[PDB]
From Swiss-Prot:
Keywords tagged on the record: Amino-acid biosynthesis, Aromatic amino acid biosynthesis, Decarboxylase, Lyase, Tryptophan biosynthesis
Entry-linked Pfam families: IGPS
Annotated pathway: Amino-acid biosynthesis; L-tryptophan biosynthesis; L-tryptophan from chorismate: step 4/5
Organism classification: Archaea, Thermoproteota, Thermoprotei, Sulfolobales, Sulfolobaceae
GO BP term, pick one: L-tryptophan biosynthetic process
EC number of the protein: 4.1.1.48
Any one Gene Ontology molecular-function term assigned to this protein's record: indole-3-glycerol-phosphate synthase activity
Protein name: Indole-3-glycerol phosphate synthase
Originating species: Saccharolobus solfataricus (strain ATCC 35092 / DSM 1617 / JCM 11322 / P2) (Sulfolobus solfataricus)
Enzyme class: lyase
Entry keyword Heme: no
Highest taxon in the source lineage: Archaea
Catalytic activity: 1-(2-carboxyphenylamino)-1-deoxy-D-ribulose 5-phosphate + H(+) = (1S,2R)-1-C-(indol-3-yl)glycerol 3-phosphate + CO2 + H2O
Protein family (similarity comment): Belongs to the TrpC family.
Length: 247
């Protein structure tokens, strides 16, 4: 990993010692990026609904993961499921139980710094993983990228700014998350978002990873080439909001 400060450095070091799982995968990859493209052609708003109990910058939420997942299954293009333990109060078991309960694509949301974490995601039933440009050296980023690919996963590669983007494009990310959040400082910046979206080639599947709040905004971004939308905290508080966003 790169040089990091504060909680991010702590979560990286901790992630390096994450115990691997020996579960076996009992179902093919249902590709997230391909379903998003499917939804785009049928003109269905593609939302990746996120299950997140806790985070350093947000509010704690206790709720039944299975009820949440089964509800979202009706509406979302996929699910994002936090497996980071210390800061996000996630679990491998939650992902495992969720993935066996639904048949839409699942994305494991964690801090992936070693190969066996990608083994965990596959073995647990996840269909893809997120990789952070910020936490990995460019070399680590590309090795884990291809490691993901060897399982048949196209990873969501997260960028926050143009420095991250130059890297993601150089190495040929086909599936990119434009996040308004810098993980290290925890600062949120939505104004760079559209400028960044404008710089991505039309062949990459683009995810807007921010608190999208209304249909008008979704329609605008959609005209700008955003393919899908990752929504977490607002759905964690009021799940049925997803219905109004899609109509
Ligand atoms: Co991030």
């Amino acid at each position: 990993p790169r040089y990091l400060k504060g909680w991010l450095e702590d979560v990286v070091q901790l992630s390096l010692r994450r115990p691997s799982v020996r579960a076996s995968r009992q179902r093919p990859i249902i590709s997230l990026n391909e379903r998003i493209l499917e939804f785009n052609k049928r003109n269905i708003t593609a939302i990746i609904a996120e299950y997140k109990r806790k985070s350093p910058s947000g509010l704690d939420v206790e709720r039944d993961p299975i009820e949440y997942a089964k509800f979202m299954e009706r509406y979302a293009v996929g699910l994002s499921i936090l497996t980071e333990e210390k800061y996000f109060n996630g679990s491998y078991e939650t992902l495992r139980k969720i993935a066996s309960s639904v048949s839409i694509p699942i994305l494991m949301m964690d801090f992936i710094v070693k190969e066996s974490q990608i083994d965990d995601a596959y073995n647990l039933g996840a269909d893809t993983v997120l990789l952070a440009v910020k936490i990995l050296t460019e070399r680590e980023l590309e090795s884990l990228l291809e490691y993901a690919r060897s399982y048949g996963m196209e990873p969501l590669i997260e960028i926050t700014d143009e420095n991250d983007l130059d890297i993601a494009l150089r190495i040929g990310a086909r599936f990119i998350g434009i996040s308004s959040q810098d993980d290290e400082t925890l600062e949120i910046n939505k104004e760079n978002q559209r400028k960044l979206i404008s710089m991505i080639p039309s062949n990459v599947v683009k995810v807007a990873d921010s608190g999208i709040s209304e249909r008008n905004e979704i329609e605008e971004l959609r005209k700008l080439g955003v393919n899908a939308f990752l929504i977490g905290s607002s759905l964690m508080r009021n799940p049925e909001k997803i219905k109004e966003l899609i109509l």
